[PDB]
Amino acid sequence: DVGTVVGIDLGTTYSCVGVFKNGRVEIIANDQGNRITPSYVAFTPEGERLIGDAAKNQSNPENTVFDAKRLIGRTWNDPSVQQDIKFLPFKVVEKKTKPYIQVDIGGGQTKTFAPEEISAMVLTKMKETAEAYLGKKVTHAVVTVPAYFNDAQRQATKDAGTIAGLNVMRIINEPTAAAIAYGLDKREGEKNILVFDLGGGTFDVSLLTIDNGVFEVVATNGDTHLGGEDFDQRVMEHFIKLYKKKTGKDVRKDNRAVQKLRREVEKAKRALSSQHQARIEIESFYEGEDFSETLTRAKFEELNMDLFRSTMKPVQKVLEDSDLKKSDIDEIVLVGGSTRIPKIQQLVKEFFNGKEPSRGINPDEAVAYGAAVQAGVLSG
Ligand SMILES: Nc1ncnc2c1ncn2[C@@H]1O[C@H](COP(=O)(O)OP(=O)(O)OP(=O)(O)O)[C@@H](O)[C@H]1O
Numbered sequence: 001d002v003g004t005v006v007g008i009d010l011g012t013t014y015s016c017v018g019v020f021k022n023g024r025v026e027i028i029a030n031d032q033g034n035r036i037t038p039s040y041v042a043f044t045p046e047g048e049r050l051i052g053d054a055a056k057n058q059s060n061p062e063n064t065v066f067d068a069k070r071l072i073g074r075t076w077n078d079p080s081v082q083q084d085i086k087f088l089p090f091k092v093v094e095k096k097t098k099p100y101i102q103v104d105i106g107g108g109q110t111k112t113f114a115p116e117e118i119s120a121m122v123l124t125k126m127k128e129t130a131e132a133y134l135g136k137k138v139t140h141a142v143v144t145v146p147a148y149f150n151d152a153q154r155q156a157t158k159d160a161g162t163i164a165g166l167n168v169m170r171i172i173n174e175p176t177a178a179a180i181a182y183g184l185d186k187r188e189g190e191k192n193i194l195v196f197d198l199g200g201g202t203f204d205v206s207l208l209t210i211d212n213g214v215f216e217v218v219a220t221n222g223d224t225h226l227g228g229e230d231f232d233q234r235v236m237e238h239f240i241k242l243y244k245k246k247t248g249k250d251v252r253k254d255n256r257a258v259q260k261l262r263r264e265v266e267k268a269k270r271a272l273s274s275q276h277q278a279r280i281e282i283e284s285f286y287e288g289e290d291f292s293e294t295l296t297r298a299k300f301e302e303l304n305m306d307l308f309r310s311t312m313k314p315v316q317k318v319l320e321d322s323d324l325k326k327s328d329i330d331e332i333v334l335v336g337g338s339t340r341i342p343k344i345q346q347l348v349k350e351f352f353n354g355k356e357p358s359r360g361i362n363p364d365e366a367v368a369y370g371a372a373v374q375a376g377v378l379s380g
Pocket residue numbers: 010011012013014015036198199200201202203227228229266269270271273335336337338339340341363364
């Protein structure tokens with residue numbers, strides 16, 4: 001008895017949970033009213049452990065933990081790990097051959113956590129979110145991973161499940177889950193599917209073939225350090241220079257001011273996917289002074305155009321590695337929150353000479369959606 005099996009997208013930056021109920025997939029909102037949840041943990045000075053939006057919205061930069069998915073299932077001496085820790089503000093140390101996260105959990109008490117223990121906290125939050133919606137406990141889940149994840153990374157994701165009290169019944173590839181959300185597994189004959197996935201921290205392109213309901217990952221590419229976070233940073237750098245020019249003041253001296261500008265930049269960015277201008281407003285921004293500025297859609301695109309254009313090179317490379325040309329692609333699936341950007345949508349369509357991609361499922365929810373589709377059949 002597996003009860004009601006949940007489908008979970010465990011994201012580098014944002015996670016999402018769905019279930020199959022009364023004949024369809026439902027994407028579940030968390031206790032803050034959001035259908036996606038930051039993959040973030042924080043420990044307050046009083047010793048409270050925060051998870052999700054409360055963790056990300058909080059200033060404790062050494063004792064905030066995020067990007068665990070970059071570390072999960074890897075050894076300490078993995079060259080990728082050694083590069084990434086240069087950029088993470090929290091302490092990472094070697095322990096039992098692995099990169100354990102070290103933080104102060106309250107009142108000067110130091111604790112170390114395996115990356116899978118951090119991911120377990122996130123999964124626990126996703127579990128609670130499902131249980132609140134369902135009105136009952138859940139014991140089992142379908143969880144997704146990037147198609148390039150290896151044996152140790154897959155097993156470590158299962159182990160995160162176990163720690164969180166979830167039996168991870170199936171590990172499914174993220175681009176496959178997206179395809180399933182769009183019903184593409186129920187096609188006759190052979191098709192080639194290009195999945196274009198641009199999230200918060202990472203960019204993944206995958207070529208899948210489908211043949212009577214069975215998926216094969218033929219080639220993968222992308223950039224592990226390109227995503228919407230990089231678009232926010234370009235906008236931050238823009239307004240920081242503008243503020244310096246207007247006042248003579250460098251706002252990078254006050255971290256919490258930057259933290260505020262970041263929160264508002266991300267919010268505005270998202271508004272510009274459906275409006276042409278957005279206003280950024282921050283009370284007592286720096287040295288008691290107010291910040292009020294507008295950002296247009298055209299300027300957001302100017303600031304990021306090189307980064308947007310850079311996404312096409314890995315698409316070209318997966319086609320080469322798969323020995324296919326553009327006209328061989330039968331379906332284009334846009335995945336990830338950043339694919340909500342009009343210019344990203346335009347660029348992909350142009351690359352494929354006017355071919356419309358699949359549409360109808362929010363792109364930051366599609367991976368969890370497909371996971372939920374499989375979980376529904378497993379619930380019976
Ligand atoms: N309407 C929008 N317009 C522009 N960007 C958006 C919009 N909605 C969400 N985003 C961005 O999507 C990004 C998060 O994407 P997603 O939810 O796919 O994360 P993820 O699954 O954790 O991906 P990754 O693991 O690659 O970080 C953030 O940069 C967020 O600001």
